[PDB]
Symmetry: C2
Subunit: 156 residues, 2 copies
């Protein structure tokens, strides 16, 4: 859309936050997201970090979200928005770029931010940072109680 928010942006961030909360309850990293079709607002998929739930080194919230959408024709991604509760790392940024997902709406980039947020813009994608305090507070709590687990999720 650019400038003005998409009619589905609040729906998308609320689902992403819902996923992060679910993940937190399961004892995992509280990062969630979903992929929405910009045309009709349909939810193509939703998910959260599965590092602890399935001993996964690649299933970040964004990757899990895309994995849950299943195999899709490349053109489908071209008119979607990926919602994530936290600014994407270099890997998740690469996934957005590879599939050509035009928009990425981020809950917050205070607890974490990689060079990927700017790289997305360099590569022609639109990035929207909401600065959602619900996401920020949830992520901060996890970092406070399990700093080492957070670090593992980003290879630190």
């Amino acid at each position: 859309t650019g400038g003005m928010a998409s009619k589905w942006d609040q729906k998308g961030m609320d689902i992403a936050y819902e996923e992060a909360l679910l993940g937190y309850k399961e004892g995992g990293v509280p990062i969630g997201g979903c992929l929405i079709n910009n045309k009709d607002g349909s939810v193509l998929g939703r998910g959260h970090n599965m590092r602890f739930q399935k001993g996964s080194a690649t299933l970040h919230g964004e990757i899990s979200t895309l994995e849950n959408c299943g195999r899709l024709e490349g053109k489908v991604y071209k008119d979607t928005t990926l919602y994530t509760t936290l600014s994407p790392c270099d890997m998740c940024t690469g996934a957005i770029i590879m599939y050509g997902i035009p928009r990425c709406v981020v809950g917050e980039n205070v607890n974490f931010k990689s060079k990927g947020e700017k790289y997305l813009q360099t590569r022609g994608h639109e990035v929207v940072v909401v600065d959602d305090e619900r996401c920020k507070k949830l992520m901060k709590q996890f970092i406070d109680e399990r700093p080492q687990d957070w670090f593992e999720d980003i290879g630190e």
Copy 2:
């Protein structure tokens, strides 16, 4: 996209790494999937932390490219472990796999070939400081070329086209 860049020298485990990656690619091909494989080796002692191949068709996966599957197969690891490893891949990494190497801080990426495919990622890796070595493995090129020939529509799906 710099004009004054550099590549890599030569590691003693590179021969072994590309052999494993190729073996993984052949395995994937036999399973009717995209023939792209890889492995991650600890530079400190030559230990194979994991190996894998593309699982798009095997698991209906949109994210399990060869490199991603390889990392997944190493299981959860302490962040510092990746910092002294080399990721081997039969084909030059897309933007997503490039991002994974960058995120985990894997210092070296040895590529089988970049003739059948090459994304902005190969250069971006070097821009981000990673060492990239393209060996131009003929075994890998022949296999991938044949796959692209036989299944153009499946190749494009793997790269979101």
